[PDB]
A = this chain, B = another copy of it.
């Protein structure tokens, strides 16, 4: 397998094509280092990540079906191997007061984007959900 085949094979697994690349987003917003909410928003728009993180179908609500995986990847993106959902959730918890992301009380591993995503990605959650083939 050459580089060509390595890229080709990942494409056939629907990887490397998130609609909202974190890196790009950070660039657009001028946030500098990639931020958590941004990273999640990248995953949530990359069809290949739908197995461990996805939109519930209700507005900007999403679920961390596989916390441990979401955590690993965020841990990798920030170069922090000890990263787990137990510290990552702390990150998200900070957002509550900064009204960026809120916790949906009662549902394990479910939060919701509360800020104005439509203006940032020019898409109503209904459209986005259709583009990713969001089930519910």
Given A2-B119, A6-B27, 12 further pairs, Cβ under 8 A: A2-B120, A2-B121, A2-B122, A3-B24, A3-B121, A3-B122, A4-B121, A4-B122, A4-B123, A6-B24, A6-B28, A7-B24
Chain B residues lying within 8 Å of A6, measured Cβ to Cβ, are 24, 27-28
**Is residue A134 within 8 Å, beta carbon to beta carbon, of the partner chain?**
no
Chain A interface (Cβ within 8 Å of chain B)?
2-7, 16, 20, 24-25, 27-28, 119-123
Can you report 21 residue pairs joining A to B where beta carbons are below 8 Å apart? A2-B119, A2-B120, A2-B121, A2-B122, A3-B20, A3-B24, A3-B25, A3-B28, A3-B120, A3-B121, A3-B122, A4-B121, A4-B122, A4-B123, A5-B122, A6-B24, A6-B27, A6-B28, A7-B24, A7-B28, A16-B24
Q: Residue among A16, A27, A28 with the most chain B CB within 10 A?
A: A28
Q: Secondary structure of the A side of the interface?
A: helix
Chain B residues lying within 8 Å of A122, measured Cβ to Cβ, are 2-5
A20 to B16 CA separation, bound complex (whole angstroms): 13
| Number of copies of this chain that the complex holds | 2
A122 to chain B, nearest CB (A): 4
Chain B residues lying within 8 Å of A5, measured Cβ to Cβ, are 122
